[PDB]
């Protein structure tokens, strides 16, 4: 069913768009930052960000 396929593509394509807008905002406009400086990335970076 090509109309169902294309309905699925149109849906997924828009959802991807939502996700782009979301992620771009989320990354660009966070007021806080944890500079890992190539080290202690992982749990310590997550905990430091919290």
């Amino acid at each position: 069913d090509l109309i169902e396929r294309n309905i699925q593509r149109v849906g997924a394509s828009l959802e991807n768009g939502i996700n782009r807008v979301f992620l771009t905002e989320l990354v660009d406009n966070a007021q806080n930052n944890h500079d890992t400086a190539g080290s202690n990335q992982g749990y310590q970076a997550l905990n430091s960000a919290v």
Binding site: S39, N40, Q41, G42
Partner: protein, 114 residues
């Protein structure tokens, strides 16, 4: 990723006050807890001969081999040495006073694993 702070291994020192005109500081690796020593510094209150000895006995100095490393003159510091001795190699370092009187001697460095 794991990050460790490195502190240098145990300090070692031998010293004598008023060592007489032909007497000596016998630096013995038995006094170190890791059993071997690396002397970096020799502070001498007058002229001295430095001698490296191997013992024929495991725990007392009975001279098998003896080499005079250097002669230092005047009062001052020799530093940045790696004069090396250990108990299991039966190695002793001797500093002999050659001044016309009594002097003070302070040797310092660090321990090495036997």
């Amino acid at each position: 990723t794991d990050t460790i702070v490195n502190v240098q291994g145990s300090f070692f020192s031998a010293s004598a006050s008023g060592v007489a005109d032909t007497e000596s500081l016998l630096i013995d690796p038995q006094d170190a807890k890791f059993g071997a020593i690396e002397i970096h510094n020799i502070a001498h209150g007058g002229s001295v001969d430095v001698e490296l000895l191997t013992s024929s006995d495991d725990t007392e100095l009975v001279e098998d081999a003896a080499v005079t490393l250097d002669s230092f003159t005047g009062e001052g510091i020799s530093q940045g040495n790696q004069i090396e001795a250990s108990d299991n190699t039966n190695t002793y370092i001797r500093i002999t006073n050659t001044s016309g009187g009594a002097i003070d001697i302070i040797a310092t460095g660090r321990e090495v694993s036997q």
